[PDB]
Each structure stands twice: as structure tokens, then as C-alpha cells.
Amino acid sequence: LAPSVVTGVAQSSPLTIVTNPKEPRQPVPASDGADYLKTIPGFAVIRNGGSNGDPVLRGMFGSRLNILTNGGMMLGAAPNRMDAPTSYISPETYDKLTVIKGPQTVLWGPGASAGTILFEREPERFGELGSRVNASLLAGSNGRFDKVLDAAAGNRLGYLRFTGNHAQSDDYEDGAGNTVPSRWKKWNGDVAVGWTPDEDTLIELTAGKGDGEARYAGRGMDGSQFKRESLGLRFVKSNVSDVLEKVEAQVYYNYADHIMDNFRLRTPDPSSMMPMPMASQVDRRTLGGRLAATWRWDDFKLVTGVDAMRNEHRARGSKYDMMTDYYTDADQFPWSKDAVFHNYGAFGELTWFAAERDRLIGGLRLDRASVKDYRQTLKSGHMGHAMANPTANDTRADTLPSGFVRYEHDLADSPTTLYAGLGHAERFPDYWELFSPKRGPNGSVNAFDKIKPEKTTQLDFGLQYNGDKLQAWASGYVGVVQDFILFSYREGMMGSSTQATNVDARIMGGELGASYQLTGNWKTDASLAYAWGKNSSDDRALPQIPPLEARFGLTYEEGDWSAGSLWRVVAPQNRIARDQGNVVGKDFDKSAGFGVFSLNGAYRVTRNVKLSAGVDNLFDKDYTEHLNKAGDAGFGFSANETVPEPGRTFWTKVDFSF
């Protein structure tokens, strides 16, 4: 019954990590989707500024991760990923966060090489008329203030539920004393009304908006706007027949509208290679749907379904004159669409409960993806001068089958699950893998033409030991990527020119962790995370792989309250690939190891209020992580200074529940 601050999260079941993102988290997370994953072993984040970092699972970056918000998928708009999907997520507003590791699900959408991440709000249910309400405030160093509110009323046959949050923090300072350009401010409000005419039927309509700004020490422009608007429509039925137990259909609509610029949160760099006032606006309209049936008879849980999605990128940029010096903002100019993706697919996943102690799971899905290039012309060929785009209105498509099988066995003597699984996923290229790179494979025409789908074939295995005093778990993976999409960086005349290529990679790695109850109120727990990758085409290492990392926790509990400390130690990373990486990160230098210590405590003052506090980086260590971006230079950043992590940090949080 003793309340605690989360420092790490175990596998609850094979390949599956399920956590509730409203409980306090030790390295206190900026109010975005990424940082709520730092506690999950296996996840590193690329630091861009103070918030809105880009998650990386087992070294795999970007769209190899399937990030969903109530089954619907929010997509960014920026050509350099300043609005990564998790920019628009505030995990504190959802009731559950689930992670599935490796390519071991077909239910939630296509091409999930690395894993699947699910934030969901769960349906309210009401006896008679009643109302619940949760709220929490968090105050901390450097102007950190996060309010958050959920509230729902309803009765037997309906409900309406409001969730909202507002968070903001000022520039953090490192362990060395300097102020890091890393300001931010965010909010979200979502409403949901739901109808339940009888206990076997549910419909819910959802609407929400959100906005945010964020200063970026690593990127050459800041985020002036992260406007999001959503509309959702769920429908479920239970116990249709006696072998058809659930039918769910849902339609989502997510619109992102984002302005990056260099004069609202920063003044334009004088020397630079861009001293103009400059802004660029980008939107992404997304419409998608899912439709699934669960059948159960005998020892068989079969889920069949089809899905579809369409999304639409548009852009427009500022134009600044250099003799009248009258700047015309972008929103006084027409929208110039340039990409439309589509996806339709169908899927099934069968689960066989053969015997008490053995389970057999297998999924397949067939996807029909396609994109059309509406860029009538391109910024290439000179000072970036216009040049007729050879793929103008060209359309690419492909049919792509994924699938997996996984066997889980429970030993008879000990409380042990052993599991092994083989999965193969194919992924149609990203918006960013197709339109962002300034050139495509050697002797291509552009990137949109020649960039192949990436097909990943991975073996997953591990165990769970969940007995009385000891709980342990371990997952490993070995896999091969064929046609890994990979960016190389040159510089000539104007800036770091990207070039996307298609290479084969070998990847292995694992994660394990354990938690031991020494006494009735003393607890300890450690976790370990290693990722490894090799570029087989060039016999190079893979770029942008997080180094080996270990966490150790120790906890004292007393029913009413708890305290804990936390040692995080990370090794250097001596496998690099200079000037290669992804659309976010170049790899440059070998990283330095480090360790960071942290203190936390929690107190249950009553049934409704519950307090929590912590100190992050107690010994004010000045460190940087391998995957962080480089600092701007127009921010006083040396040759290739990565962006420093935050120094000593104090935070306190109160959690209400009437």
C-alpha cells in the first residue's frame, strides 16, 4: 500500500511492458511522449532541447516504432522531425501505456520493426450516477510547473469525460553552470462523450486540441506552434454470438499544424548561413480507421480485422526581402501540398492455449501501401534554385506481408515463463525517408524514386521469473534488416546535405532486469539494456546506437510512505559511423561514460491526496548522452558539442483523487 516514485518498469508478460503514466517518475519527464519511455528499459531519447525528444528503441529510430493514441496514429509535419509524433502526446493524460517489443504484433498497424507503443484512455464505467476526478500539480527547478486534470460524470447509460493538462518549463542549466536554450510550454484538452444503452454496447465520440512552443538548443530553429486537433469515433459490441465476443470499429482524424522559425524564441544567427527572419509552416492531416472481430472457442482467441489510413502533408514558408527588409510571414501565402500516403491492410492473430503451460501465438498481415509525390518542383541544383521534379505526380505502391510466431512455455517446478518468437516485418518508407533527403541512392533521380522498403527478420526470446521474493525478466533479440534506410551527411556550399541509402544491417541486443524484496520494507532492483548494430554493406558499425546502460534502485517502505535512491551508469559507445545516422542525428564522436544519482520519496497523506518529491542528478554531474543533437553554434557551442543533460534538479508533486 506504500506509494512510490517509478524509476524503472519490468516486463509484465513476454515482450510486453505495461505501465500507468500518471504515477510519479524519477528522472522527471518533460511533458511529452518520449520521456515517459526513458523509464522503460531499452529506450533512449535524442535530446533536441528541453522537451520533444525523439524515442529510440533498441537503437531503432523513428517510424520503426508504432506510436498510437487510442489506436489512432498522430503524425508529425516537420521535414526535420521537430514535431515528432511524441511532441503531440502528453502521457499524463492517458491511463495506460503499453509497449510491445520487437515485430510481434499485427493488430495495431504496419511495419513495426522495433516495437509498438500504445497510450490509451480506458472507458469509464458507472454504477448509478457518480463522478470521479483526478488532478495533479508538479513544481520544480527552472520554472517547471505542470497542472493536469481528468474528470468524468455519468450513469448506467452514458458519461462525459474531460482531461486536460498544462505544462511549462524555462531553460534548464547543466552540471557545469551554463543555461541551455530549452524553454517550453504545452497544453491539451480532450473531451469524450460515451453512450452505453446496455452493458454489451459502447459508443464514444472524442474531440481534442493542443498547442505548444519549445526552444531547441540542438536545432537551428524553434517550435513556435504545435497545434493539434483530433476527432474520434469508437464503437464496440460484446457477446454478439457465443464464439464472436467483441466487435470494435473506430475512426480517427488527427490534424497537426506546426510553425518553426528563428525569431520568436531566438534571434537570428548573425554569422550563421541563415541570418534572415525565417519561418516555415507545415500541416499533416490524417484520417484512419480500424475494424476488428475477436472470436473465441475452445482454446483459441483469434482476432481478424482490416484497417486503412490516409495522410496529407502541406507546407509554406516565409519570404524575407533584403533591400526593403519587409518580412512577409508564411500564413500570407498559399498552401503547397506535396505528399499523400495511403495504407489499407488486413490482419489476423491466432492464440492457442494448448495445455495449462504452453501458449502459441501467430500473426500475419497484408498491407497495400502507396504514396504520391505532388511536389511540382524541388529546391535543388544550385543555391537551392527551383528545378522540375522528375517524380512530379508519380505514384509508388507495394504489397507487404508481415507476421510472427511466438512460443511461450511455463516450467513446472519454478514460476518461470520461457518464450521464443520469430517475426518478419516490412515497412514502406516514411515521409522523411522519401522527401526529406536532398539526394537518393548513388545515381538516382531523387529519393522518392529509388528508396526500397525495409524488411526486418528478427528472433526474440527471454524469460520471466515471478516468484515470492524475486521477480526477474529478460528479453533478447537477434535480427537482420535488409534495405535499412540510412542517412549520410556531406557539406558543400550551403549546409549539411543528407542522402538516403538502402543497406543491410545485422542487429542484436537485449534487456534484463530483476527486483528483490530483502525485508518486509527494503526493496532493491536492477535493470540492464544493450543494443548492437552493424552496417553489413560497408562493414561499418551502425550509427546512432545507444550505449550499454544499467540502473540500480533501492527502496525503504513503511505502509504510509517510501524513499528511494537510484544509480544510473552508462558506458561509453565506441561503435560509431561518422556523418551517418538518421534524418535527425549525425554520428560524430565516441561518447563518454558516466553515472548519475537521484533521490525520491512519496507520502500518502490521505485517501485522496498523495505527495512525492525528488532530486535528479544529486551530485550535479555535467554529462551528455551519445544520441543528443549538436548545439547550434549561434548558442555558443564548440566544434561538435552535444547538448548537455540537466544538472541538479528538484521536483515536488501532489496528486488529488476525489
Numbering used by the authors: 66 to 723
Quote the paper.
As indicated by the successful structure solution, OprC contains a single bound copper and shows the typical fold of a TBDT, with a large 22-stranded β-barrel occluded by an N-terminal approximately 15 kDa plug domain that, like in other TBDTs, completely occludes the lumen of the barrel. The copper binding site comprises residues Cys143 and Met147 in the plug domain and His323 and Met325 in the barrel wall. The CxxxM-HxM configuration, which coordinates the copper in a tetrahedral manner, is highly unusual and has, to our knowledge, not been observed before in copper homeostasis proteins.
While OprCWT and most single alanine mutants can be (partly) loaded via Cu(II) incubation, this is not the case for the C143A mutant. We hypothesised that removal of the cysteine could lead to much lower affinity for Cu(II), so that after SEC, nothing remains bound. For each crystal, datasets were collected at 8,800 eV and 9,175 eV to distinguish between both metals. Bound copper is expected to give a strong anomalous peak only at 9,175 eV (which is above the copper K edge at 8,979 eV), while bound silver will give comparable peaks at both energies (the silver L-III edge is at 3,351 eV). For C143A cocrystallised with Cu(II), no anomalous peaks are visible at both energies, showing that Cu(II) binding is indeed abolished. All 4 residues in the OprC binding site contribute to copper binding, but not to the same extent and, in some cases, not equally for both copper redox states. This is illustrated by Cys143, which is essential for high-affinity Cu(II) binding but dispensable for Cu(I).
